[PDB]
Amino acid sequence: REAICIHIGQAGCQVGNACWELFCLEHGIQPDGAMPSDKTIGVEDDAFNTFFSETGAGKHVPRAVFLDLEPTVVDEVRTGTYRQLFHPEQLISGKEDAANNYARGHYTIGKEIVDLCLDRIRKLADNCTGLQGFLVYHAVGGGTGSGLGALLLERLSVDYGKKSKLGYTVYPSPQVSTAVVEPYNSVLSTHSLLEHTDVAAMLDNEAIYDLTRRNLDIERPTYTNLNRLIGQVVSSLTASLRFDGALNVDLTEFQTNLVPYPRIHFVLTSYAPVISAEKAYHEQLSVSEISNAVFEPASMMTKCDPRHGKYMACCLMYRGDVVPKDVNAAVATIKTKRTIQFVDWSPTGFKCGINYQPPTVVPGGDLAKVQRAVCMIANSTAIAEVFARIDHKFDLMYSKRAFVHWYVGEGMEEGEFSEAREDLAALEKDYEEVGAESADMD
Amino acid sequence: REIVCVQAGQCGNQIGSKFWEVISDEHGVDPTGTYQGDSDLQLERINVYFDEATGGRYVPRSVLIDLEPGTMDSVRAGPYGQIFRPDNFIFGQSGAGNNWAKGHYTEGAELIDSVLDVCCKEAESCDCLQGFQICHSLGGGTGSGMGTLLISKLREQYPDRIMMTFSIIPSPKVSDTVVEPYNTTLSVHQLVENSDESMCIDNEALYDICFRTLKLTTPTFGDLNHLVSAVVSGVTCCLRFPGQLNSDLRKLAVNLVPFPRLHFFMMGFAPLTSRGSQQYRGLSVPELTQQMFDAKNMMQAADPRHGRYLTASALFRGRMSTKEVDEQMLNVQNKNSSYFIEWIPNNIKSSVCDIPPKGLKMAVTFIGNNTCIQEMFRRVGEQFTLMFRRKAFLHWYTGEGMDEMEFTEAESNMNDLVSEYQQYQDATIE
Amino acid sequence: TKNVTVDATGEYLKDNIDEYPATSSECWGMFMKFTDNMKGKKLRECY
């Protein structure tokens, strides 16, 4: 039933604003936390409990923390329109940033702020009765997101133990880039994702820019558009917990179906009816059309081409007016295709979900209103190509000890670079070995 | 002669809701539980499935089990949901995780004692107990693991009674779950030792029934579960109404099962026909027999044409002649003689019951024991060996606590079942 | 940017309450509430 959201740094707080905007509008909570209880047609229902708790006077408050080292972005949240929705203790801010240094976040500065965060998370977890995971939003390119993300994840593993932690992570794009030191921070985040995370979904802004240019008709997109797309994806995946459907799917079923071996937990995400209002009334949007859409690389939210690899498992979430027979016919047609290949040890490649609640329309939004949508998360060996380009850029800079002074002076052994780079190299070799056909049988 | 029902998991609870709607409709029980029927014939066998509560009311002898109460709240919320006794809903606090080992070992052992206590309380209240009836899927998590756990406990406590299961099995073309081969193999291993009679249905076969025969534009799970509830309520009809040649679950088992491992059967129901066509052809025994043996009307993906019938049974409902039944079963056996196993001189048992389902003049349900069932097991075993050789998802099951030896035992036992079917396929008189 | 993007639609939502979509989530019923009310009341079990 309940889930707790952890938002870290700048990207995580900005994506949080769009997410909580959407979850308010989907449940029907007003921006001040109230509800017009007297003007109602249906009947009042418990579905909010996954994301909200009531005080008893009928105000709603959300199950989230916002973590940042600079004050300005959290103060922007504090002074905006949703000021009264959040409890002020939940909005935690430090004094000074981690200055794009993973070492600064992890060793020196995040250690001061981390105990307040852990006390708040404990206070949330005590007010729960069937917690079934943590959702974490962060970028691995910046200093506080990488370093404090890593420390918090390490502490959570010891404190909560077996409880699941699912991360949505903005990884450095393969040629769009924002800062010089991105490779070091992304590498040194390898251990946290590899050993302390159950599924990690990777996103690149260059793909969402391509999707918003090609499918939507937006010439000049900005981060609020990308964050609205991410919020829609999260709402689709969590709808299975919150609304009626033909085939429900609990968050533990994703973990059971998608991860064959404990390191192979990085998944690609895509969303089908990204369409503008003027195009949407010219076209039907049947089940088979959106199912065909989710497999084209123009639909993906990560810059990778799955044609360079093999699928291991796919999980397809359908929401809206869909009939199971059409889903089965569509999946059988996909299975027929020659450019889609599965590893021979995974014969039953698909998991399906079908939910009755159609996707919500946001007043300022740019997506059209549509009766049905499908969302896919899938595990594929093509992801190995994404790590190799980061490793090449890391190998380039570390050779000349280009910026090592900052990290070693701020507290890190030089050995840690070689350690992290060898561990990610071993992860690449794992993805090479697992994907090799067992052609030798006798 | 009263049956106790157990419904497990989402599929089981959904099928159960439609079954108890059909049963309450035929006996004239209002959705409040009040008897509103119009003949004593309805009342005189009501005991078989209902217990009598005070001033009119009847309550259905069924146990509902699930690991999260969400489904239980959905079934309680349905149109007939009120009839069920509140104390009969048993639920835990965490899910099966779509994992057989969780359903069998961790949450199974946590809940099973309260289920065994309720099942014993219900069984020992009967004046004479007939078999148990269980509905579940083998591909799921709590259905497979806890259903087979409960079956084993009930077989320990009531070894002289009958154990009957209706079971849903994965389609050959599209999977609904990635880990289906493990759950199916382990469940079939448990069933072949424990069960007395097992019926199998493919959702793909119900889709092909709806599209080809009924030409439905927009089918839903309510239609598939209505077809299943119709056949389920048809099998028991001779237990609970008069007829010229009464029949019973034990008599079906004795005539259908030649050897104790060969107890997996195909199902069909005959007077299926589209609303546009129905004006063009009246019901008669030749029409029911022709549809009844047409593989188009069979609820599994395996086709009889690739195998041979060891035994079959037909249960007829309606006011009808013995000539049409006896001479039709002889004529069908004579014209298609290559499809019947030759060392049994007559493979078909018949039974006739006076009272048809409402709004049909006549109906028949068909139960068939056919060697083509070996193809399903062979397909599941191949997919299992591909997954097991590569340790594809095994850490979940081993982390719950299972020994790897269980997988090799279950594979070997299922492979021997396939071999035994193949051996009986190619037997000869010599 | 946050003003013109999010606060504008927040103000529009404040002015108009007919934009909230209807839904049906009948899976939240009495047994779920019974499990909710009974946290920490485990009694009479054998180990």
């Binding site: 047609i41 009755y356 | 439905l216 839903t220 209505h226 299926l272 609303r275 | 007919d18 209807a22």
Partner: peptide, 23 residues
């Protein structure tokens, strides 16, 4: 809305598209 046996039936899937919770 027709049953597989030809009889009429009530709705079984909620109608939600185009609906609003608050009047």
């Amino acid at each position: 809305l027709i049953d597989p046996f030809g009889n009429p039936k009530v709705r079984d899937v909620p109608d939600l598209f185009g609906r609003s919770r608050y009047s």
